[PDB]
Amino acid sequence: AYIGPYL
Amino acid sequence: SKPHQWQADEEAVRSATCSFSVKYLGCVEVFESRGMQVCEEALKVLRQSRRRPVRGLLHVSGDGLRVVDDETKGLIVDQTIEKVSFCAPDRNHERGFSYICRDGTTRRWMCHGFLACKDSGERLSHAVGCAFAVCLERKQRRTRAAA
Numbered sequence: 001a002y003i004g005p006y007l
Numbered sequence: 008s009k010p011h012q013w014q015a016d017e018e019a020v021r022s023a024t025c026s027f028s029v030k031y032l033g034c035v036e037v038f039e040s041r042g043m044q045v046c047e048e049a050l051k052v053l054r055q056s057r058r059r060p061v062r063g064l065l066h067v068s069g070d071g072l073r074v075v076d077d078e079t080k081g082l083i084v085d086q087t088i089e090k091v092s093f094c095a096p097d098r099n100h101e102r103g104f105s106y107i108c109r110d111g112t113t114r115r116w117m118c119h120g121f122l123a124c125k126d127s128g129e130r131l132s133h134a135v136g137c138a139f140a141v142c143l144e145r146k147q148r149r150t151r152a153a154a
Contacts, residue, residue, distance in 0.1 A: 002139075
């Protein structure tokens with residue numbers, strides 16, 4: 001996705 | 008809504024001062040609160056349970072999501088965005104999302120769920136999606152190798 005679901 | 012108002016909100020978060028309507032379901036108990044697979048199921052729990060959804064607006068300001076109803080006028084998720092476990096949109100299959108907080112001040116791994124009011128992945132998704140941007144604007148997040 002962006003930051004949440006990854007970073 | 009294309010270059011006009013969307014350009015504003017996209018910057019609001021940058022300066023920490025945005026917001027968008029929504030029906031924040033509530034909160035549930037979990038054994039993770041640190042992932043995405045838990046959010047997909049967590050939201051489902053918010054329904055099966057008795058976590059009636061609010062009818063107000065999410066106070067997003069690139070610092071901490073402070074969802075508040077438009078009836079009781081009370082803060083539901085009074086947590087910092089930098090401290091919270093962050094959010095993770097279900098699967099953008101129907102404009103669904105869900106936050107998560109590792110205990111902190113919510114007892115334990117408390118999973119959260121909130122379905123966008125307008126429902127169009129263009130109010131909370133991109134709004135809060137950037138809310139964290141201000142937190143780790145330089146992608147300080149340590150998930151990959153990096154260099």
